[PDB]
Amino acid sequence: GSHSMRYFHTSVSRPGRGEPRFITVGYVDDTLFVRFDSDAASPREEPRAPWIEQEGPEYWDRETQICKAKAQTDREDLRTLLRYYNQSEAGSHTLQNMYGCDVGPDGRLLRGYHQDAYDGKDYIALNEDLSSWTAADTAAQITQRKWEAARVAEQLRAYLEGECVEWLRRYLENGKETLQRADPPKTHVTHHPISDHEATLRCWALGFYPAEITLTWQRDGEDQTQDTELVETRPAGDRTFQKWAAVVVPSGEEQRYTCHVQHEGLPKPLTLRWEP
């Protein structure tokens, strides 16, 4: 909504090679701030953003205990699911979980999430009401009944309405100067001749934060929808993102084309042209 916090988790069984590998990372908006990898020497949750490092030793200890506890629960859950789906112990399997909260500018919960997937397909998810479940097949329906009986939705709901939101606002204030500042895209158009008769115009949006952005190409003000090649937004590797859009045009027609950029870091949507 206005801001968000998310935790991602992946356990992968490794039959004939070792205990399942467990990896989890947390984000506030599009900023990574913590990671835990069970394959790390003496595994501990570690800081990955500047503003979280001020948390004290009890924070790092409790977060590490939660991670090792989730790594164990997933191992058991991997065993359970082999039974629910009647699979062999010799095959590798993946369990994924994402939960977190979005808050509005009031700083209250807008939406909470808690969902899981087995082997890359939906398994069971907490609905928006933070009260009922959507199970994706009959094995997940076993889980659903057990989780209804054990009143699990209620515990997650208390967390997502409380602790989730409270520490997000904490992270937002402590990391205010980076997380509450939108970095607008640096834009420009390049021109790449294909032959003597045609060329590609590529509209670049670089160094921006957050990741969300709209890039479009228009010819004499009309949208070149089915003709633009639009790559997926990608990390520059310095916590900002990059994106480009391209269109191939007839030589001599270049100046009829316009690139239009929307990003919340921009006061108004940009229009740019190749300035030869």
Partner: peptide, 9 residues
């Protein structure tokens, strides 16, 4: 800060 709840499938 992570949820401490440990639930099992």
């Amino acid at each position: 800060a992570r949820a401490a709840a440990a639930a099992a499938a």
